[PDB]
Design a protein around this ligand. Structure first.
Ligand SMILES: *C(O)[C@@H](C)CCCCCCCCCCCCCCC
Ligand SMILES: CCCCCCCCCCCCCCCC(=O)O
Lengths: 352, 352
């Protein structure tokens, strides 16, 4: 399988980190925690973020019903904008799509996003639907792996992954507890789409982006608590452990090497790293444990600073960013993501 | 792709429909509606349902946060039971599972059920996880199709589907409302797992269950309202339109005809129908639109009456009932399901 188009889409409201913090500190029930909020927002190394709602609308977003409704309205059109952009990058059409995978962790939609996006964009009624929910930040790498897994048995097919993460809209569940504030410093809104295509279909559509060669999921034992949501009446509340960093440093190099040994490869044999940004400590951790030079994660740091942590869609934004960089032809690309599980997901890429 | 195991797990607490109704109409803020409730319950053609909680805990399940936490815990125990069971039917072991897909619409878990059941069963840390959410009732059929879609690109692998639906746990969201009351007459708790196996793996494994030949999703235009969740602070509230029956009567025939024409089959060629027991009005609409004899949907009528509507898990119990009764060796089997979308999934089976 080979990527034919990537496309990130963001809501048009872009705010500075400063503008967001300055306003956020003045939100109901928050002024008291200004010190830690500024600390956390500054330490986040996010310089700005696209929000789906005008910044000053958030204090009014206290109801999970409203929020999740706005999510469904906004997720789909961010999703279709993303999909179309990738469809056009692949010079393909909605009718060309044979399967659609949808990745979100930040909203609950039944009928799922894929159903609604497929409605909007006029996909064939018999598109295969794969609504992925609960992969979280890992869903961008994992979604790409699942496309491979699909196209592997359907060489003529077009399979799309649409990630939409509207982190902002989980605001109803946000309280001045440090974990929620950590998330309030890092997470922004945005969608992204990957149009992938089978090997046979590849030459017909002049498929540009990288070949998706292989993936390896890595579920860590006894680590449910590391990451995820505590779901409740006030909605999706971030659970996020400080232990996470130490899981990376202990075990990521192991995942990255066992997967790379399977391909007669090394750390140095990879031409562009495509890493999810949990936040700076996370980026430092994978950089440190994988003994990565500064340049290797620069795009994901740049993406972090430009649009923040978009969860699933992040790794697909920096994948789109790294594609535009045009890295060495035929060189190994390595998607690395991680999320609730706790798990990590390596995806072996090959660039053109 | 070939099914190697089908197992249906239910909670130990079984209650007659009369037991349920008599206690339900005494729950807070419902005696005002005891007439319509008893009417909906009696019309439901369910004689009994397994409930994951004692019948008299439910009135205290008013909080979505509580109900969802219990969901996660109970759904993993039930989930593993069904998987262990299906693993035992397949004579296979947890270590053999190469990909696990999980289906639920009745609770929200990040990390997902597949993450948790993988940890409980000690599945290899590299299992490929596909947590489907928002397929709803269609997920048993579509889950099998996904399995097929995975196994068709990975012929040496074992893929499992674990469906766990604890409909009773959506209780915080039920109101004295026709739709939600229809839900309370139909829906019960239970799980099921299917263990399917790639083609190159079926012979060594001795998979005995039916072949998975093909599948067709039918995503109807402009039909979001037909079925779904109203999601809010009270949890998952059933949206169910009475256009459903009419949608089926007008479009189901063309779904199966367009699908069966692709295999040059008529409805007469189907040796066993594995239909989702939505409700008596839906089973009537299926039989009427497909001109089916009353023997064709008997196994699904019987599941309905015995176990109620288990959302995605029902068509899998019925599939096990079908394999039990053992259909003519080598005849066509058609799985028929419908879920939020509005969509239809047909999966073509071959009996052994
Ligand atoms: C990756 O593993 C998963 C868990 C990603 C989940 C998304 C986290 C959302 C964090 C909640 C707070 C968001 C607020 C944004 C700022 C808006 C300003 C008012
Ligand atoms: C005493 C509790 C009895 C059972 C109460 C059941 C209440 C309604 C449950 C509805 C479950 C709907 C599941 C999803 C259907 C779909 O959208 O596919």
């Amino acid at each position: 399988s080979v990527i034919a188009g990537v496309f990130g889409a963001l809501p048009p409201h872009r705010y500075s980190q400063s503008e967001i913090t300055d306003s956020f500190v003045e939100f109901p029930g928050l002024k008291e925690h200004e010190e830690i909020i500024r600390r956390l927002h500054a330490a986040a190394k996010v310089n700005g973020r696209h929000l789906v709602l005008p910044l000053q609308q958030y204090p009014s977003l206290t109801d999970f019903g409203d929020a999740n409704e706005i999510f469904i309205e906004k997720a789909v059109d961010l999703g279709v904008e993303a999909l179309l952009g990738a469809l056009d990058d692949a010079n393909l059409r909605p009718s060309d799509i044979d399967m659609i995978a949808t990745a979100t962790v930040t909203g609950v939609a039944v009928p799922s996003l894929d159903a609604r996006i497929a409605g909007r964009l006029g996909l064939r009624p018999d598109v295969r639907r794969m609504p992925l929910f609960g992969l979280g930040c890992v869903a961008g790498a994992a979604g790409v792996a699942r496309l491979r897994d699909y196209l592997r048995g359907a060489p003529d097919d077009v399979a799309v992954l649409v990630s939409v993460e509207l982190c902002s809209l989980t605001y109803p569940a946000v309280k001045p507890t440090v974990s929620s504030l950590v998330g309030t410093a890092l997470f922004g809104d945005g969608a992204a789409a990957v149009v992938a295509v089978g090997d046979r279909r590849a030459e017909q559509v002049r498929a540009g982006g990288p070949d998706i060669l292989d993936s390896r999921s890595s579920l860590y034992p006894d680590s449910l608590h590391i990451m995820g949501w505590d779901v409740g009446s006030h909605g999706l509340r971030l659970r996020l452990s400080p232990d996470l960093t130490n899981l990376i440093e202990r075990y990521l190099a192991n995942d990255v090497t066992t997967f790379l040994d399977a391909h007669r490869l090394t750390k140095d044999d990879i031409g562009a790293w495509v890493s999810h940004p949990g936040g700076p400590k996370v980026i430092d951790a994978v950089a440190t444990s994988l003994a990565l030079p500064p340049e290797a994660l620069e795009l994901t740091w740049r993406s972090l600073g430009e649009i923040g942590n978009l969860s699933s869609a992040s790794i697909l934004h920096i994948l789109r960013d790294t594609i535009e960089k045009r890295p060495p032809s035929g060189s190994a690309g390595l998607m690395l993501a991680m999320g609730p599980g706790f798990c990590t997901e390596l995806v072996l890429l090959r660039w053109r």
